[PDB]
Design a protein around this ligand. Structure first.
Ligand SMILES: *[C@@H]1O[C@H](CO)[C@@H](O[C@@H]2O[C@H](CO)[C@@H](O)[C@H](O)[C@H]2NC(C)=O)[C@H](O)[C@H]1NC(C)=O
Lengths: 27, 50, 49
């Protein structure tokens, strides 16, 4: 949890810039 | 100074082709919660796009 | 020395917990990857202007 807590998208996406989810989720 | 174009009714919450006083594009028009100052005519995103 | 070793280990783990809670820069190696990619996309998007 400490590691995860320590370490715009619309504006980018709207130009044909999508982000694909990882196959393996954090869980 | 604008040409002799007829205006249409404003349509919200639908995908439309729009032309606002010469500004053109395709998108969905929704009511905004942005506080435009009295002199501001349009806004831009982080990407500096309308 | 089993009791000492277990104590030294448990203490060392506690130190990691505190070091991570305190020092923001500890994960700079992962944050740097995130930052490089964020810059690459922002640069790409700004080129449209
Ligand atoms: C080896 O070093 C450890 C510390 O790393 C010694 O354990 C400490 O002993 C002092 C007394 O001098 C205690 O006040 C500390 O609380 C102890 N620390 C731990 C983690 O137990 C250990 O006694 C040393 N062993 C030898 C043979 O010198």
């Amino acid at each position: 949890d400490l590691l995860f807590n320590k370490v715009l998208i619309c504006a980018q996406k709207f130009n044909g810039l999508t982000v694909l989810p990882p196959l393996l989720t954090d869980e | 100074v604008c040409g002799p174009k007829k205006s249409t009714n404003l349509v919200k919450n639908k995908c439309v082709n729009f032309n606002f006083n010469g500004l053109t594009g395709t998108g969905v028009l929704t009511e905004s919660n942005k506080k435009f100052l009295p002199f501001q005519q349009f806004g831009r995103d982080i990407a500096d796009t309308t | 020395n089993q009791k000492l070793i277990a104590n030294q280990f448990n203490s060392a783990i506690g130190k990691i917990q505190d070091s991570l809670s305190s020092t923001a820069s500890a994960l700079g190696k992962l944050q740097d990857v995130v930052n490089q990619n964020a810059q690459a996309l922002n640069t790409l998007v700004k080129q449209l202007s």
